[model samples]
Target: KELNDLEKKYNAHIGVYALDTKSGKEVKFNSDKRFAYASTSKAINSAILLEQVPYNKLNKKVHINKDDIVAYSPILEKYVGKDITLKALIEASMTYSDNTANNKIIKEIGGIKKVKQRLKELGDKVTNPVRYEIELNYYSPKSKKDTSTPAAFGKTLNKLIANGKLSKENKKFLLDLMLNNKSGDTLIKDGVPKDYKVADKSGQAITYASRNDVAFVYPKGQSEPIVLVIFTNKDNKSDKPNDKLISETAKSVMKEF
Candidate 1:
């Protein structure tokens, strides 16, 4: 299999859990391993927030503060102290991976503990988001950062699909935002044909800690979408996003579709 080949070629730790919605066919590789989730947690965060906040309320404004400021946030930084809607923060966090915007969103929706509780209620025991985006920098070797198993995260996505846990409209609302994601477009969508539609979120931990992407791939003429979660932690050298490794693996998987 191409996935197995990629594992051998890169000498990396790769985990995957995929399901074809139509045929019920499944695929798995190192799916039980836990890894830092990074910004990929933004999607789950969005889901929980959306479940509580209605469309009108989500469009309500909130002020961004100096305390919300964090690294890797170009979009939200410019709008600091200015009032922006929760909807906009969701876009910035998911589409641009705005760190501060995500922190603000977490704060608005009760806190990190609330999000974790929601995930636990949904039966995801492995994935945990214990800190804000900025708090990731203060981690010691023993500190537990945001982490999730491929299987647990994949199930979270499954629950978000077709009103499994959310209303159909709410589920579509989240998927639409993911489908329009501007960042990491070339990663999971690299090998997917233009005719097919894919809704996904990508994340890369600092240095070579982890690189991951979870996606719902809608094949041409198929109403149901396939779910794929890929995670890798290789001893990378450069301080660059691991798009190439992920794209190649995605292409390998697309070939089977």
Candidate 2:
């Protein structure tokens, strides 16, 4: 009933999964439903890039010309025409949700095919990174777009963190970057206490069709962190209200668990 209250109060179609990593306790609410994942897919791309490419290759400089410019790209504009490293581009894409940086990385690493292949190899069937971030808003009706179920996304993240798939250095590097991200703070991060550390990715569509966040939160005094994935598909266009819903839902989950 409380979950229903959350759905009604925000006028949202919500999918969620919260995992207490220590006890293995979990909760789900419509967690299998698919929603367009928006920039949340950036994390997957970043992970794949880290896996398939060596650190030395990631540090190589690549020329970024004026042609790479896209609307809403702050980081790319800051480094245009300069030789920037692949690692810097990945950081910009993940931390700032820089669309141009994301697209460039996608192209450099062999396009969306490589992204899809990597997802398959990782066994994340629920996530479909079908197009570039800039093209996500303009996809045709027949064109494929990015989508993911909360449960599948949560499982993938858990495996990445809990399983020994990644080297300690890479895992820490990715998680630390997320923890220090420059993105919006009014969603899942807004709900948690200041002492709790969260490594997360936040995503939203231009039409406000979806507002989502997936996070691994380390509550105070816990040896292990909990994973929280909240995905929202709104019935209306008011993006501001969605922020309150996400924050409050995260707060409620933290309190309960």
Candidate 3:
């Protein structure tokens, strides 16, 4: 009823899925319906790359062709002529939401197909991003691929920390990037209680069909972090309003813990 009320007031579809680290209890609302996975896919892309490349190799520089630059590349546009370190590219992708860095990491690690298959191998059945950043940011109601339900993505995140293949160092490497992420300043993080911390990725959908933030909320004391995903799409023309809905949803969910 709480989620439904938010949807009705905002006139937008909302998908939410949150899970506790220790108890495995979940909170779900329209979470089975797949929503566009915009820049939020960066977490998985970076993870896929990390699975193959070790921490020592992050210092290696990667060539960025001038033509590879795309719209919304604040960090990478500066490095157009100069090659950037793999670690920098990941930072750019995660911290700055640089579109150029996102596609480069995908190509650097392999391709959209590699990330797609690897997620399947690891048991992520719902998140299937079939296109690169440029083509994927625009939401299409009919587009079936490059989508993930909040529940499925949250479960994937849970496994990565609790039961997956990442070494402790690599997990920290990725989570720290997320924790220090500079984007989504006005969303989920604001909803978390004071003194709590969150590792999250936010996506501003190119079209008005989706605006999202996926996160791991770290509470005070011995409490284990919780996985939460908030996706709002369709029936809305502006992302600004969706931000409140996302944060409010987060606040409501956090009250349970």
Candidate 4:
């Protein structure tokens, strides 16, 4: 697989796959394992909330408390004193990349146990977000490693949007949520066609060196949309080298897609 080769050459451990919704063609590189999703886990969390809140019910507001929050990403600095609703929190979580918003939503959605049960109901078997190191706040220095399969995550997003798996309103709500995502300085979006509508979320735990993007591209007149997941781990010490390698490899994978 091109993704794996690039990962090997550039010291990236990429996990990728694509689903042609129109033709029902699924192509996988490393799509059977679980990888650290970083902020990409927000998508899974949102899906769980949709089961109860649904999309149509999304119009109403659900206030986010000051407590019950854990900080992960840097963009959550401003939500400290604000009164946030489900719509507002979801927007901040997906669009502006807010960690506080995620803590609030996960707290309301029955915590880890409920999220696990929801994923089981949705038929997604490969992801274990609430129990992962990042979710449990139980990571040792050696347990920081996280990864995911592109096939399962891609299929989850596609199903959430295509059928009533997430409800029509919820699907559209998530569709817009992903589209408005404000963070994507590296990986797939850096290479793909900027003019096309690409809805995705990128994540990194080791500064900006480690990179990952999970997104769906809507090409005009293309019944079969393109789904791409690129995970890059920069073992390099220097920032320039790692980001540049990710940029170049992402461009290569985008061209292949």
Candidate 5:
């Protein structure tokens, strides 16, 4: 009765919470395994960068001389300067949801191979990216490459945060990078209290539309973190029930829990 009442009040599809390094608690309408992550896969690339590159190198100056750069927004055109740092590029990628900066980061990290290698190192077979298409993208299946799952994806976030997967320094770096993920106009942030500090990232689209949000909440007077992840998809609709569902569900959960 209580859960239904809340669902009626908010209107949602799926919602879940996974700690920095724990299994997860899900209150959803469909299979958590049936969801597809869109641009939210950027975190995988971020993890690979943190694992393979030195921490200090994140802020080192770099040149942007690559053909893969895809300028989908004005952020890339607005920066008005060269000699940008890796940190800047990564920050811009998540903050503004800039595809250009994302491609730039992948190029610096030396492509999806390094990302897949890092994922494999974790013994997580599901974390691999699809391949054979072109320069940059989420790996088209027709290209014969495989994709990742939300379970494995959430586990990676938890592992990175709990210091159980990546190094302490690397974990910090990843979390910091997520902190710069300023696309909070999304779901989880809509639900969380304003004062809380949530480090999260999201992915959304149409043909492969879905939403995946993972964050460690720092609520007032709470030592233990309240982590959350909500992934869902709806096919062939201008107004996606999936997006609205996840957002409303997140609001309900954060408000009550």
Candidate 6:
């Protein structure tokens, strides 16, 4: 009732697919619909980079040229001429949602081909990456440049979070990087209690009217965490309504527990 109400209230489409990783129960609402990723791809991109880059090699050099720094890079743009490492790039990308850092990781890992190939290897049939940031962030429901269905992205995140795609140490490190970090607090995070442990990635593309936030919200004392993928697009407007819609949807989902 809450999600659909928000959908109608905002004059947009919303997709949700969540699961309790332990009991194997799911909550689906427009779960299979495609939505633009925007910055949401950073988390998945960082995860794929972790699987490809060795731990020892993480500290190795990553060249960040002045021109490489694109818009919406609040962190990476500051260090334009400086040399960084793969690990810092991942952290900046995951935590800061840095556009420059994200593109740099894509280039370092051999571009979208390698990343898309990895997604296919992981059985993610619904995700396709085609452009770099600024360009990629120009999200459109009609275009397939950078988009994924809720269930496919959810499944991919499940593997990244719960399955063994990454080593134990690296997995913990990445999750720690994401926990309560920058971005999207007014959305899902606000809907839940502050004490709840949440490691999440957020997406905002006003150009195409989308706001997405996916998370692994850990309940206190629970062994298995909950995975929530909420993707909303086709909104009549971008600024306030969508965030409320997303937040309310999150509260509605969490209300189940």
Candidate whose TM-score is highest: 3
Error of 3 at 28 (Å): 0.8
lDDT of 2 by residue, 33-55 (tens): 87777887777667766766666
Model 1: CA > 4 A from native: 137-144, 236-241, 255-257
lDDT of 2: 0.78
Local accuracy by lDDT, each model:
0.78, 0.78, 0.82, 0.62, 0.58, 0.82
- For all predicted structures, in order, the TM-scores are 0.89, 0.88, 0.93, 0.79, 0.73, 0.92
Looking at model 6, residue 250 earns an lDDT score of 85
Off by over 4 Å in 6: 235-241
Q: Model 2, stretches more than 4 Å misplaced?
A: 54-57, 138-144, 161-164, 236-241
Q: Is candidate 1 or candidate 4 better by lDDT?
A: 1
On the 0 to 100 scale, the lDDT of residue 71 in model 3 is 89
In candidate 4, residue 168 scores what lDDT? Answer: 67
What's the lDDT for residue 38 in model 3? Answer: 87
Quote the positional error of residue 67 for candidate 5 in Å.
1.1
Q: Model 6, 128-237: lDDT tens per residue?
A: 89988878877766788788989999999898667756877788888888785867777788787766777788888756578889999888888578999998877444
- For all the candidates, what are their Cα RMSDs to the real structure? 2.4, 2.6, 1.8, 3.7, 4.5, 1.9
Off by over 4 Å in 3: 236-240
Q: Model 1 misses residue 101 by how many Å?
A: 1.5
Error in Å for residue 187 of model 5: 1.1
Candidate closer to the true structure by TM-score (higher is better), 2 or 5 = 2
Steric overlap count per candidate: 0, 0, 0, 5, 2, 0
lDDT of 4 by residue, 1-257 (tens): 26656667776555666665666666666676445567777776776677678655666665444563556534445555555567777777787666776766777797767776766776877656645324433322234333346766777766665444566677778877777766765555566666556677776654325456777766666644576665544444343225555456546655644
Could you tell which candidate, 1 or 6, scores higher by lDDT? 6
- Compared to the true structure, candidate 4 yields what TM-score? 0.79
